[PDB]
Design a protein around this ligand. Structure first.
Ligand SMILES: *[C@@H]1O[C@H](CO)[C@@H](O[C@@H]2O[C@H](CO)[C@@H](O)[C@H](O)[C@H]2NC(C)=O)[C@H](O)[C@H]1NC(C)=O
Ligand SMILES: *[C@@H]1O[C@H](CO)[C@@H](O)[C@H](O)[C@H]1NC(C)=O
Length: 273
């Protein structure tokens, strides 16, 4: 087994402009986002390849869960703006929490909130208690610790419940996170009216994203003019290209070389003028 992480990020706005939900929530497994929720449609929705995964989460219910998280999230934001006597301004509260395992061994945990970009409050499951970094965080901590049970629950979420969810989610996400999809390539050349000729070598439809794409000119690894790449969450595939400029009076043979963890040995693709 290898590394796997579960992360959730909450964003709440005290005074939201039109067409922007006051509260957004999202979740990513490793390098891919699998769900999303906002205060407009108020419905948890799977994403990417998880749109086709059946029986991993009863989203209809999770929507009710989110609606609960949301009400506590904005209230917290309400109290902060309240404290600072400035409800006329536009403020923001970001929270981040999740956990990670490695070799089926819980190896991480985090739960931190940010206010207007500054560190606000974060939980330390070792004490266990919340650490306040902002004067108003002091009240929040007070409220979130009014009963001896509260900090026991939080520790319980990071050390027991969250990793439980990661493991569950992992049983249904094998055919996704563990993929090793080989990269397909296409070497194309475009000539602009005036400049030199340019050769584009694209590597598409692959996963993981760590790839090695480069050109050569008669065996000599050439320096790229343009380099780029992207992630398409819908498919859960990466794309990575490279471009080189070729002198007007050159005949030498250009070959694109692609390396990957999915490939047994590197691929080569020459450009036939
Ligand atoms: C992942 O999504 C991308 C874009 O939605 C797919 O790539 C498109 O492929 C079509 C036909 O192959 C092209 O006409 C588009 O220009 C491509 N979009 C872009 C901007 O890359 C890709 O095929 C999807 N992955 C798979 C294998 O389904
Ligand atoms: C770790 O994986 C094993 C199977 O390899 C599974 O039975 C177990 O529930 C997982 N976590 C543990 C040790 O509780």
């Amino acid at each position: 087994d290898g590394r796997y992480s579960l992360t959730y990020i909450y964003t709440g706005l005290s005074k939201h402009v039109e067409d922007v939900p006051a509260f957004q929530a999202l979740g990513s497994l490793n390098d891919l986002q699998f769900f999303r929720y906002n205060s407009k449609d108020r419905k948890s929705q799977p994403m990417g390849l998880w749109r086709q995964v059946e029986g991993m989460e009863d989203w209809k219910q999770d929507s009710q869960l989110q609606k609960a998280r949301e009400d506590i999230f904005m209230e917290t934001l309400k109290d902060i703006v309240e404290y600072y006597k400035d409800s006329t301004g536009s403020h923001v509260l970001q929270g981040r929490f999740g956990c990670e395992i490695e070799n089926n061994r819980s190896s991480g945990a985090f739960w931190k909130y940010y206010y207007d970009g500054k560190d606000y409050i974060e939980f330390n499951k070792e004490i266990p208690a919340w650490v306040p970094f902002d004067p108003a965080a002091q009240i929040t901590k007070q409220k979130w610790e009014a009963e001896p049970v509260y900090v026991q629950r939080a520790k319980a979420y990071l050390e027991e419940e969250c990793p439980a969810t990661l493991r569950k989610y992992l049983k249904y996400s094998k055919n996704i996170l563990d993929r090793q999809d080989p990269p397909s390539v296409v070497v194309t050349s475009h000539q602009a009216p005036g400049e030199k000729k340019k050769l584009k070598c694209l590597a598409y439809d692959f996963y993981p994203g760590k790839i090695d794409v480069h050109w050569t000119r008669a065996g000599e690894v050439q320096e790229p003019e343009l380099r780029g790449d992207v992630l398409h969450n819908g498919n859960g595939t990466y794309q990575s290209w490279v471009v080189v400029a070729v002198p007007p009076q050159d005949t030498a043979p250009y070959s694109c070389h692609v390396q990957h963890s999915s490939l047994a040995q590197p691929l080569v693709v020459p450009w036939e003028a």
